[PDB]
A paper describes a structure:
We next engineered a loop deletion in the regulatory domain of hCBS full-length (aa 516–525; protein hereafter referred to as hCBS-FLΔ516–525), as per reported approach, and observed improvement in soluble protein yield (10-fold) and decreased degradation, as compared with the “loop-intact” full-length protein (hCBS-FL). Importantly, hCBS-FLΔ516–525 crystallized, and its structure in the AdoMet-free, heme-, and PLP-bound form was determined to 2.0 Å resolution. In the regulatory domain, two cavities (sites S1 and S2) are found at opposite faces of the CBS-1:CBS-2 modular interface, with S2 being more solvent-accessible than S1. These contacts are likely to be important in the regulatory the ability of the domain to modulate the activity of the catalytic domain. The structure of an engineered version of full-length hCBS dimer, also determined at a higher resolution in this study, provides a structural interpretation for the lower basal activity of hCBS; the regulatory domains are not interacting at the dimer interface, as found in dmCBS, but are crossed over to contact the catalytic domain of its opposing subunit within the dimer, thereby sterically hindering the active site entrance. Inspection of our hCBS-FLΔ516–525 structure suggests that the Leu substitution on Ser466 may lose its three hydrogen bonds with residues in the active site loop.
Cystathionine β-synthase (CBS,3 EC 4.2.1.22) plays an important role in methionine and sulfur metabolism, and is a unique heme and pyridoxal 5′-phosphate (PLP)-containing enzyme. Its canonical role is the condensation of serine and l-homocysteine (Hcy) to form cystathionine, which can be further metabolized to cysteine or glutathione. CBS adopts a three-domain structure encompassing the N-terminal heme binding, central catalytic, and C-terminal regulatory domains. In mammals, the activity of CBS catalytic domain is increased up to 5-fold by the binding of S-adenosyl-l-methionine (AdoMet) to the regulatory domain, an ∼140-amino acid stretch harboring a tandem module (CBS-1, CBS-2, collectively known as the Bateman motif) found in a number of proteins.
Residue numbers in the entry:
A (entry chain B): 43 to 397, 405 to 515, 518 to 538
B (entry chain A): 43 to 514, 528 to 548
């Protein structure tokens, strides 16, 4: 076994010329008009000015986001996945149809699974239990095999994601662990490409770089290059509370060692992380990470993930010293796709304790002044439905059976349109026209609750615990109320 | 009210010089090094060669995918959202802080909500009930207000997405419906940009273009440009069963008018759709759409949506008429993000009948239907929750076990402890020998029955490390992925 935290034997030093590098460096390769496969859509990610969040928190400098979620697999890790595989192929390590096994928090796994799918490798991913089910869904669809490990397993225990990866490799002939924690291809991808894109996009002018840290390849690769090209650029590392990557060590004094944000922080120092090139660390927490991720979406239209939020949360503190004319770049590592049922969900945010209202929000449904609806039996014909709605002056009716079970809604307009198009005959029962989907809501529920319900259903049927329908309410009724009140 | 199917008053005809257009026309532009905002990340999408799928279905031509899911909002509609807003701003129609209301199947709503978030407009989306909750979650996060309409509401009834959009607008001052069904800004975005990109990318050489159809903006804009610049190019339109877009009308004969694929097909002919520039239509269905979308992911690594699947399902038939050296381009409209809990989920697919246990078990390994009991389980040592960390080390070592379920006096399973994690914890000073195991115990696990299959175990092991075998409450066994691997390897030796 080779431990993921063994001290690095890299003899790189700032001031040492590139000639002396024992490593293979891949230069930018002119992209053809037609990409031979999706793996060429990795790199050259956009750099986008942040327009509202910096100003809101009193930054004077320019704040720019390097948006790594536009890579083919949706994350920054697509760069290292591709580079680790290509170098291993060049080395003769990785032969056609071999098996790739990787311990990952998710994104390196997705990157590797995507390349494996394209290139024809068997791919086995080992991922802690805390990681999102959205990651599992994409991994499965890409044909990866998936093993999970307890989130709280110490990294050197047999059941850690690293321990289990090495134990699987030992049982599977022609398997390899490319090993993002030790493989130079990880930070070198960022040194050769990500860093050169940033310089190019900024015309070599950059005062601060803020990056969250997991393996440390991103911050290490970018920093080694920037210290060479742009030594005035301050390097700011972001580490979650619970992790021990940050220096000085006094920053890491808490009991808690778990957190909800995914992809950053560890219980060991990865070999590829060079902490000497980080000028200053900040600790982040889950609440600010998710607050800022939601802000990035809502104010900048940037559909990014949790650690992107961590990074920007730090950047608005760290770049406060910068002046107008100066420039801070942040790395946004992955996409909102990984977190659809996590921080993107208000219910989740509430459950986890991580979370303004219009004037009408706390009012109750009954204050709408509901009209008691006409109801019809499910045995009514399409023709008699038209006749009774028009005769009684209603445009719709709940269909309710003899036992009082609400079966759905019919409307005058849809019944007429269906008749006139020959979809139903006047003597048909209403089965082919009835709207079956609706949501019940109480007389005593809030209009806020109604508003939420109306994001999923057209019709809310008003009921009460104490068999009767008190009203049918749609979004137009709620608007009419709100508008009338304020006119 | 203006019906979204009124006959087009456009007098374009194939052969009329571009100098006769009365429209505003843009073109693809080089983008700046630093984007001023994310709305610049729209257009110039990749054209990617499809390497496995074409060959597998016998195609001789080159098959290329235009991947619109790389746009800022995740779809092709980001092009028309931006264009409709920019034109309405230049017009003087849309003023600072006005309200945008749009009837949408979801992607145009997302596009407009994204632009509205950036530029500061109130945005109200009106979306049929069938559209995914993933769309709702993105819309919500972008600050859009969301209203829904019955999926099988006829377009001309008051409760359709188009009818409800009109009724909302009438009650909200300073609101506008940009109206993708009638607004020239929709097909023009594709005529001016999408089509020109496709031609630049193909060096002006292609033989067939296959596109699925909803508003008709994509196919109409592309086809009008291609018919002018590449008149050999065959235009193939894809329409779901249940929709009336396709011609001849005989193709549209069907029992149902509902389907699960999102973003294509309608019960009316949108004003922006020019069907005269479509050479041939193919009817698609849900099963092939989702089969092909999953195949695009699994074989090409293209993280696309349902209608992308519809399009490729048709392309592998339509392009059979092409020979080696010809080229077919397909439009892939949106991303897998919208369908995470729909076609991406095997449970949803099974529930819907688009996946049948038969070919779900054809691809299955020999061990798949063996039972957990056939692993030959060892009775595990269990320990009480009052055991100390020190005594856990001792009893595991003494009795020869690497792990033990923690089980209270009443038989409740509290979790697992392991020798390795207990020792690492002790050596690192996280616990002391006399501590109880609360801080080291793994509380997460999944129960499985002796009579469950190894296929079921395999699924379980994609979510949990430990499966604890129980029966109707003694523990029969503890199983992990490594145990399953060892068993399969031993039987295959
Ligand atoms: C003048 C430039 C450089 C020199 C002279 C240098 C030198 C070395 C040497 C001697 C090794 C040890 C090989 C071995 O133990 O088998 C090594 C490993 C490594 N280098 Fe470099 N290196 C340079 C640049 C870089 C850069 C730019 C990066 C990353 C951005 C990097 C990352 C690594 C990593 C991750 C390893 C593996 C560490 C280990 O196994 O302990 N190096 N380097
Ligand atoms: C090249 C010569 C073209 C001419 C002479 C032409 C002409 C016209 C005219 C005169 C109208 C106004 C209808 C009215 O309100 O009276 C119109 C509307 C329109 N045009 Fe064009 N057009 C051209 C190209 C295009 C192209 C390339 C597209 C789409 C790619 C397009 C799509 C439309 C649409 C969607 C409308 C709105 C239709 C309506 O409201 O009924 N046109 N066009
Ligand atoms: C990997 C990752 C990071 C950190 O990048 P390293 O190069 O591993 O330090 C941050 N966020 C997410 C979501 C990641 O996957
Ligand atoms: C809009 C859309 C289509 C059809 O494009 P049109 O330009 O409206 O014909 C196909 N698929 C998806 C997912 C869409 O959003
Ligand atoms: Na993590
Ligand atoms: Na649809």
């Amino acid at each position: 076994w080779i431990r993921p935290d063994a001290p690095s034997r890299c003899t790189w030093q700032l001031g040492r010329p590139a000639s002396e590098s024992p490593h293979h460096h891949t230069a930018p390769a002119k992209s053809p008009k037609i990409l031979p496969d999706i793996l060429k859509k990795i790199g050259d990610t956009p750099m986008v000015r942040i327009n509202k969040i910096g100003k809101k928190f009193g930054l004077k400098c320019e704040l720019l986001a390097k948006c790594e979620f536009f890579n083919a697999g949706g994350s920054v890790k697509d760069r290292i996945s591709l580079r680790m595989i290509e170098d291993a192929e060049r080395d003769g390590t990785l032969k056609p149809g071999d098996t790739i096994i990787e311990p990952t928090s998710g994104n390196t796994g997705i990157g590797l699974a995507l390349a494996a799918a394209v290139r024809g490798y068997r791919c086995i991913i080992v991922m802690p239990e805390k990681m999102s089910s959205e990651k599992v869904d994409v991994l499965r669809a890409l044909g990866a095999e998936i093993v999970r490990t307890p989130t709280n397993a110490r990294f050197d225990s047999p059941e850690s994601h690293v321990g289990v990866a090495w134990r699987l490799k030992n049982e599977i002939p022609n398997s390899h662990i490319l090993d993002q924690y030790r493989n130079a291809s990880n930070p070198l991808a960022h040194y050769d490409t990500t860093a050169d894109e940033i310089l190019q996009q900024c015309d070599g002018k950059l005062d601060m770089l803020v990056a969250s840290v997991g393996t440390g390849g991103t911050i290490t690769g970018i920093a080694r290059k920037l210290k060479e090209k742009c030594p005035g650029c301050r390097i700011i590392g972001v580490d979650p509370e619970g992790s021990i990557l940050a220096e000085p060590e006094e920053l890491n004094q808490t009991e808690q060692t778990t957190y909800e944000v995914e992809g950053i922080g560890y219980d060991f120092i990865p070999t590829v992380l060079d902490r000497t090139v980080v000028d200053k660390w900040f600790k982040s927490n889950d609440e600010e990470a998710f607050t800022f991720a939601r802000m990035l979406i809502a104010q900048e239209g940037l559909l990014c993930g949790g650690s992107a939020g961590s990074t920007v949360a730090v950047a608005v503190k760290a770049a406060q010293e910068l002046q107008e004319g100066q420039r801070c770049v942040v790395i946004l590592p992955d996409s909102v796709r990984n977190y659809m049922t996590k921080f993107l969900s208000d219910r989740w945010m509430l459950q986890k304790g991580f979370l303004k209202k219009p004037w009408w929000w706390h009012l109750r449904v009954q204050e709408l002044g509901l009209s008691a609806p006409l109801t019809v039996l499910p045995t009514i014909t399409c023709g008699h439905t038209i006749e009774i709605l028009r005769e009684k002056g209603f445009d719709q009716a709940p269909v309710v059976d003899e036992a009082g079970v609400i079966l759905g809604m019919v409307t005058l307009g849809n019944m007429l349109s269906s008749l006139l198009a020959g979809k139903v005959q006047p003597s048909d029962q209403v089965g082919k026209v009835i709207y079956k989907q609706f949501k019940q809501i109480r007389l005593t529920d809030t209009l806020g609750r109604l508003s939420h319900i109306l994001e999923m259903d057209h019709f809310a049927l008003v009921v009460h615990e104490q068999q009767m329908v008190f009203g049918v309410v749609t979004a137009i009724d709620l608007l009419n109320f709100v508008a009338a009140q304020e006119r």
